[PDB]
Amino acid sequence: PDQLYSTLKSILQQVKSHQSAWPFMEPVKRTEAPGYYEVIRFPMDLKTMSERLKNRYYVSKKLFMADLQRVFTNCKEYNPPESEYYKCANILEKFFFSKIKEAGLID
Numbered sequence: 691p692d693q694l695y696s697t698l699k700s701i702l703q704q705v706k707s708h709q710s711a712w713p714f715m716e717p718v719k720r721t722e723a724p725g726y727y728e729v730i731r732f733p734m735d736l737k738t739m740s741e742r743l744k745n746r747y748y749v750s751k752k753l754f755m756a757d758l759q760r761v762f763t764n765c766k767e768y769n770p771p772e773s774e775y776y777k778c779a780n781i782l783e784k785f786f787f788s789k790i791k792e793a794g795l796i797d
């Protein structure tokens with residue numbers, strides 16, 4: 691209940707503090723990304739996730755992991771594989787899986 695909240699908040703904070711998190715900190719701007727919102731149907735970012743967390747949306751580990759996973763998969767679908775964004779996604783995704791395992795969210 692509140693142990694879930696505290697674990698998620700800690701995980702989410704560590705992810706947001708990571709050096710490769712900078713591309714994901716806020717919603718993608720239509721302005722900077724031609725045809726993003728036609729192709730990416732469930733956009734996600736770490737600011738929206740902070741809100742969802744604060745709003746007590748993450749009642750299960752699955753809902754949290756789906757959202758954060760979506761951040762990475764959206765990025766990898768949209769961007770070229772050797773783009774800096776794609777590289778950041780995979781670095782931070784590694785970090786993400788490391789932290790969820792460390793906390794026994796993958797039980």
Ligand SMILES: CN1Cc2ccccc2C1=O
Pocket residue numbers: 713714718719722723764765768769775
């Ligand atoms: C994760 N991001 C951030 C961003 C900014 C501009 C264009 C694409 C992206 C993207 O996939």
